[PDB]
Design a protein around this ligand. Structure first.
Ligand code: 6S1
Length: 353
């Protein structure tokens, strides 16, 4: 522990709340609602500090590039010498190689472009951020093929699955069978397991929009971050959070696969946030009891009690009844037989673009 004490923190989602922070020698910087393994999401490594006076004097900002995504946390103290304490405490290929084809996403920090590589014909996604790295040896995360820089832009070329978005395949079919969900669920769990233990990283945005299928119908987890129905309670009320957020997410995604609908819904965001924090779930009668058990545990409102939420993390999901007779090393080596294969001949079949 290098320094500690109250700071004001801006509510990343639904404004300012005091919170007791702990900077540490490992890099970590975390805030608890009262005076109280490590995750690289909360680290200060290669971050960039910014004193400022908008929209409240003695404000400061930590901005970090984590992997291919820019992260901002904003704080505010009572006096400038105080802000200053904390501050000090805290401190080839080029664009010509590709065709630009479709705008996959815009946002504040940059753009994501569907791109064909001229020298091979193969399609990737290019993340371009307005102004070293070892990949994850795991097949269902999004791999980074090329990273390069121009004079005003940071460029990241990464896999882009050509098998369709899982949100579309579901919109079409309305609902998934309990065993198709099991297939998707197991790949996701393997992927998040890898991230949690091999990287000490949480994904935080597990939702349907962030899952696609490759040529073979296997899962790909997206890395296209540029900037409610899926937010964990813990995240709403703006606590310390951890690896369990991804399991809350996994429950929501699985709930919607197997019930063809969202576990909590409402047009008004404030009554949605109420529901997330207060309503227990009415599960369908049309639904297997091992499934019910998985979802109930994945969707527990207290992260410490949630399934996957203990010291064992993902091992607690992997050995649930619902996942009986899944060989996990099989999953990792893509040895499961996808139920759905999308309409696609080659890696390059633009049918789904
Ligand atoms: N490449 C991958 N493809 C598929 C899912 C996740 C990743 C992925 N790989 C990583 C590797 C490292 C790191 C990292 C995290 C914090 C601090 C430093 C590094 N992050 C990685 N992520 C990864 C990607 C996106 C996120 C967000 N959705 C954007 C903020 C949440 C989080 C984590």
């Amino acid at each position: 522990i290098v320094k500690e004490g109250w700071l004001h923190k801006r509510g990343e989602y639904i404004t300012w709340r005091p919170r007791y922070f702990l900077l540490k020698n490992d890099g970590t910087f975390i805030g608890y609602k009262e005076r109280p393994a490590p995750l690289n999401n909360f680290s200060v490594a290669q971050c960039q500090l910014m004193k400022t006076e908008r929209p409240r004097p003695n404000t400061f900002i930590i901005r970090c590039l984590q992997w291919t995504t820019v992260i901002e946390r904003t704080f505010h103290v009572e006096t400038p010498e105080e802000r200053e304490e904390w501050t000090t405490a805290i401190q080839r290929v080029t664009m010509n190689e590709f065709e630009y084809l479709k705008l996959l996403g815009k946002g504040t920090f940059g753009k994501v472009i569907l791109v064909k590589e001229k020298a091979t014909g193969r399609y990737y996604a290019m993340k371009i951020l307005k102004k070293v790295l070892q990949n994850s040896r795991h097949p269902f995360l999004t791999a980074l093929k090329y990273s390069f820089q121009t004079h005003d832009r940071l460029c990241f070329v990464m896999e882009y699955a050509n098998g369709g978005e899982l949100f579309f395949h579901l919109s079409r079919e309305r609902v998934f069978s309990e065993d198709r969900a099991r297939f998707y669920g197991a790949e996701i769990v393997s992927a998040l397991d890898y991230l949690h233990s091999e990287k000490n990283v949480v994904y935080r945005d597990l939702k349907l929009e962030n899952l696609m299928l490759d040529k073979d119908g296997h899962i790909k987890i997206t890395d296209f971050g540029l900037c409610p129905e899926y937010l964990a309670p813990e995240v709403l009320e703006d606590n310390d959070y951890g690896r369990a957020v991804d399991w809350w997410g996994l429950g929501v995604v699985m709930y919607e696969m197997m019930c063809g609908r969202l576990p909590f819904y409402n047009q008004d965001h404030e009554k949605l946030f109420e529901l997330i924090l207060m309503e227990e779930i009415r599960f369908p009668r049309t639904l297997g009891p091992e499934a019910k058990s998985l979802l109930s545990g994945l969707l527990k409102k207290d992260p410490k009690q949630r399934l996957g939420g203990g010291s064992e993390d993902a091992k607690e999901i992997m050995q649930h009844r619902f996942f009986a007779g899944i060989v996990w090393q099989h999953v990792y080596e893509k040895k499961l037989s996808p139920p759905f294969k999308p309409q696609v001949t080659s890696e390059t079949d633009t049918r789904y673009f």
